[PDB]
Design a protein around this nucleic acid. Structure first.
Lengths: 97, 140, 91, 129, 79, 150, 25
RNA sequence: GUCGCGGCGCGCCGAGGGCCCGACGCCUGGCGGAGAAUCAGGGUUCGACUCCGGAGAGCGGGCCUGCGAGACGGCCCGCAC
RNA sequence: CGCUGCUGCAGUUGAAACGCCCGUAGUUGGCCCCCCGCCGCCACGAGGAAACGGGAGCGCUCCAGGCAGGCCCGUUGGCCCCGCCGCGUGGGACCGCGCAGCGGGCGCGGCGCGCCGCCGCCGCAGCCCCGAGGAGAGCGGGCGGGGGCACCGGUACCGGCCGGGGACGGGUGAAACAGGAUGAUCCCGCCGAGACCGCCGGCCGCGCAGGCGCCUGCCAAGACCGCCUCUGUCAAUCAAGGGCGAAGGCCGGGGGCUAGAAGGCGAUCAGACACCACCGUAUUCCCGGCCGUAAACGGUGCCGCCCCGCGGCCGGCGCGCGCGUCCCGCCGGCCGCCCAGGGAAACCGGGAGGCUCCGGGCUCUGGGGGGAGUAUGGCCGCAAGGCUGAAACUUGAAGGCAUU
């Protein structure tokens, strides 16, 4: 039974893609198959941000934002609940939940 | 697949049939000649033989019984056959190394029923058919 | 032609002696030692070995130091580059 | 490339009839296609066929009357004994009474019925019902 | 009401040259009024090879993969 | 499709239906033939001749003005290229690949492309020889290729 | 991977038969 | 030489003749066809024996008689038994 | 038993498209000339034993029989079937191919001629199917992580050299083993090697697949699009034959940072000699050969022909329009969804559709499951192995997709 038309990967017009590493499992995953989430979360927590902004002795300081692209393997991502098993019909459905 | 269908492709069609007709297990058994050479009953309905020993075979599960059989050495090819003597208590009719005619179980060289390894079965003992002995139509 | 089918091309002399490993190794070293190399001056493939480490181009009439069995050794090629990069960098 | 041209066109005619389109454009044209179309027009399975002649192979525009169930090609163009043309009809055509197997004869391209009428065997171009 | 026999000219043009009922030139012979001459120079719309205006030494045609652009004052279409 | 490639493409040139000589014509058939003859005297591939005739002049198709092909015009006058322009242009393409291969010892891709071009010279040679355009002795070989192109 | 490990085990038997034949030779 | 053509035997002179359209080699519990069996059609299967044609009379050879047999209910020899 | 498939089988997933490409045989080849010549083809003859199969006629008492019988065809026992790939005759649709310039007289030229020659002789319109939504070649402009060689950036892991400042550092699920007052970790400054090209990086693109990403100079190419450029069937697919082919491996150099098959050591367990630490050889990288395999997969060969909507993306090219990387086409590919249609269904629908209403062409592969990819022979390799490839024997399911 072919579970998915994509075959789990977004390789189209391709034969090979770059290998990447699950950030927790440290396993080699094809780049297309990897989760590839992106986070632009700031460096310090929202509460600390008010305390730090009052403390800062430089005017116009804003909290630095930290940017990373989290790539997790299927087993790593489903276990830490980055993605979730979906119903047969809901598997076809895409879009950020 | 186009199944090579051209007006001048008649050797290809013939060649494909002769090569791929050998894939069928039944056509292979029938026309390879391997059965004829290896058959204890080689192109014979039945054969004469001496009973090597009277040994029952335990039946394949689920069925659970000791189906009395006799190992038989054939006069024609000196090969040993395991032949199931049939009906009830008919092994007693046979004595060790008695003349025995044996015919295949009826699956054309395949084992019939729970008996393990029984390509054949006993039909006659020392000139008397086992049913004839069983029904007492003809005594030993 | 191809008088020796296998890699007994220069090692036919040894005959049935010394073992396959020695003859295989000798194929590479011997073929390299009697090969003609290109002189960095004559630019003609006329460099041949005189002794271990000494190579002469018959036309350029220039003798150059080299590897025992090749005009240029892999370690040396790398060193010349490292010395050039460091030299250019220092100036 | 195109080895059989009739088959490619007839398949198009059947495909247009499936989507209920009266006019079809057949890109490759041939005298055999021409004759095959003429026979279907006589039996009224198809209507007037107009060939747009081009300086190349030619294209045919065929108006359909919506009355053809199926057409076909027999590859290779077998040799049929005149006596056994009935066997070809019994299997390929439905009913002895309805349907036309189209043949080619030294006399000319002809209907299976006409072939029986003069008892001349030939090669089967294709079949239409 | 559409009969393939008579294709609309404005629709036929939209179709690829080969796809059209009659395979035909997709391009027209143009005639350009020269900057240095008053005489039309018949040119191809999709010409690539440099075409020199009569007398003027330089090519008046700057080629492109499709219709060639022109530099000097030119004319549009056949004249 | 595309011989030694997998691409399928139709970028052909569609000829005019009316086989009409140009209405906008200042060229007599004798004028047209002479220009093809003189371009050949200077020395030009036939494909180039039809591009000069179409761009500098207005002869859209030579067949339209004079009922003959461009090579047929050059055979009649006698300035016919001995090796046909299509073979000659593929032989040139191969020689160029081999020269590049000489510097690039490990260009495996170039070697693959070369086998393609060689095959298209070999297939075309077998056709031209059967047509008798090419002499029965003619053969494409690596050594002779350099000289045959010159 | 039982099939991968089964192919590996046939290989070993194939070598043992091939080598045993040489000792017999 | 034969009833006769032929490498059919011999000398001589050349360099052929075959083959992926399967040669050659090998195997066959291979007589061949007329026919037989089974069966919508197409196929499949089998050809000891009636009819025909072959081939043999334990096995190889070799022969005379005759119009015709390389005969075996002829002869001769080698080999078995 | 259409489970041998010519009719008439299957290969996405039940068995099964060669990993990929060139390629010789082989097989298949768009249209197109009416008018004959050879083909093949089809019909019609002729001739070549019956029995046999069919069948006319017939009461063996009925029959299986037999050609008999009856107050008689000249009583019967007809007639068909020796596939006769031979033969003769017609037709020319289809199907293969045909190289000659033809003529008029000399010539009625040795029983009718014809052949060969000789005569521009003035008779001939004396002589080119065409331009495949086939293929090859050209030109033009863009196209892309396509290839080789070349050059070189950047941190990071790692080592090394200071300087500072100070007890732990590591590692983990928790631990433990190694590191540290010869000052570790940590910080910064350098210094050197080797690997790798991050985030941009994708329903992006490119390559025959395998595969493809620093500066990407310079060297040849490749599709695609455009065109009133050129050629004129030059084609499609393919045994035999060649090339290429991830990783692992191998032979021999160069290198050697990082991970790390082996191995060693902590732990964990009943035992792990496994999963998790920690250390680390081969290897990983480069060059020169091998090897020839992968779930080399779209698990779907290739060349076509048609086939409905709804959008996206990339590469050209046109149609316009105030006018914007806008619209609309043509597109060459990459894709999603889907009405019919198809299927055992999952699902395909740019096909897995046009198929029991079964036939475009070509090449490969499968025939219940094991035994077995074994045995043996071959070939190839240095090896590991790869390629080809059984049989005895055994046995009622194995398997697919779905439902609860």
């Amino acid at each position: 039974p072919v579970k998915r038309r994509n075959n789990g990967r977004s390789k189209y017009n391709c034969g090979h893609t770059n290998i990447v590493r699950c950030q927790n499992c440290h396993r080699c995953v094809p780049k297309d198959k990897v989760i590839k989430r992106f986070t632009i979360r700031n460096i310090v927590d929202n509460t600390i941000a008010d305390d730090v902004l009052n403390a800062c002795v430089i005017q116009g300081f804003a909290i630095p934002k930290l940017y990373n692209k989290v790539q997790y393997c299927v087993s790593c991502s489903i276990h830490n609940h980055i993605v979730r098993v979906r119903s047969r019909e809901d598997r076809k459905i895409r879009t950020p939940p | 697949s186009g199944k090579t269908s051209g007006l001048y492709t008649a050797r290809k069609l013939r060649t494909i049939r002769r090569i791929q007709r050998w894939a069928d297990k039944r056509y292979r058994k029938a026309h390879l000649g391997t059965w004829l050479k290896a058959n204890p009953l080689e192109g014979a309905c039945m054969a004469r033989g001496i009973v090597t020993q009277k040994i029952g075979i335990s039946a394949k599960q689920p069925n659970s019984a000791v189906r009395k059989a006799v190992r038989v050495q054939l006069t024609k090819n000196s090969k040993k056959i395991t032949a199931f003597v049939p009906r009830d208590g008919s092994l007693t009719y046979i004595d060790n190394n008695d003349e025995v005619l044996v015919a295949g179980f009826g699956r054309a060289g395949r084992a019939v029923g729970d008996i393990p390894g029984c390509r054949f079965k006993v039909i006659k003992v020392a000139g008397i058919g086992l049913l004839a002995l069983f029904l007492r139509k003809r005594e030993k | 032609m191809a008088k020796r089918t296998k890699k007994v091309g220069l090692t036919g002399k040894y005959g049935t002696r010394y073992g396959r490993a020695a003859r295989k190794q000798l194929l590479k070293i011997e073929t390299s030692q009697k090969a003609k190399y290109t002189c960095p001056f004559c630019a003609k493939d006329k460099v041949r070995r005189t002794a271990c480490g000494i190579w002469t181009c018959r036309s350029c009439s220039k003798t150059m130091a080299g590897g025992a069995y090749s005009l240029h050794t892999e370690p040396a090629n790398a060193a010349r580059a490292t010395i050039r990069r460091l030299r250019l960098a220092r100036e | 490339v195109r080895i059989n041209v009739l088959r490619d066109a007839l398949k198009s005619i059947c495909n247009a009839q499936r989507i209920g389109k009266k006019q079809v454009i057949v890109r490759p044209s041939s005298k055999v296609i021409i004759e095959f179309l003429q026979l279907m027009q006589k039996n009224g399975y198809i209507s007037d066929f107009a060939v747009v002649d081009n300086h190349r192979s030619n294209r045919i525009v065929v108006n359909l009357i919506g009355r053809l169930n199926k057409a076909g090609v027999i590859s290779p163009r077998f040799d049929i004994p005149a006596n056994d043309i009935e066997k070809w009809v019994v299997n390929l055509l439905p009913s002895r009474l309805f349907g036309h197997i189209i043949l080619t004869t030294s006399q000319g391209i002809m209907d299976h019925i006409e072939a029986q009428h003069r008892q001349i065997g030939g090669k089967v171009i294709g079949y239409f019902y | 009401n559409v009969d393939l026999l008579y294709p609309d000219p404005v629709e036929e043009q939209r179709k690829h040259k080969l796809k059209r009922l009659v395979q035909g030139p997709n391009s027209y012979f143009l005639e350009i009024k020269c900057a240095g001459c008053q005489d039309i120079v018949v040119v191809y719309s999709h010409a690539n090879t440099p075409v020199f205006c009569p007398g003027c030494t330089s090519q008046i045609s700057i080629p492109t993969g499709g219709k060639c652009a022109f530099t000097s004052q030119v004319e549009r279409y056949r004249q | 499709g595309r011989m030694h490639a997998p691409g399928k493409g139709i970028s052909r040139s569609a000829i005019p239906y009316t086989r009409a000589p140009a209405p906008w014509n200042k060229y007599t058939p004798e004028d047209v033939c002479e220009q093809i003859y003189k371009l050949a005297k200077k020395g030009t591939p036939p494909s180039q001749i039809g591009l000069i005739l179409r761009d500098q002049f207005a002869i859209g198709q030579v067949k339209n003005v004079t009922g003959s092909k461009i090579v047929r015009i050059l055979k009649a006058k006698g300035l016919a290229p001995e090796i046909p322009e299509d073979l000659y242009c593929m032989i040139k393409k191969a020689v160029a690949i081999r020269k590049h291969l000489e510097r690039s010892r490990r260009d495996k891709d170039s070697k693959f492309r070369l086998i393609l071009v060689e095959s298209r010279i070999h297939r075309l040679a077998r056709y031209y020889r059967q047509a008798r355009r090419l002499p029965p002795t003619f053969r494409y070989k690596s050594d002779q290729a350099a000289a045959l192109l010159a | 991977m039982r099939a991968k490990w089964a192919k590996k085990r046939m290989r070993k038997l194939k070598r043992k038969r091939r080598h045993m034949k040489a000792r017999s030779k």
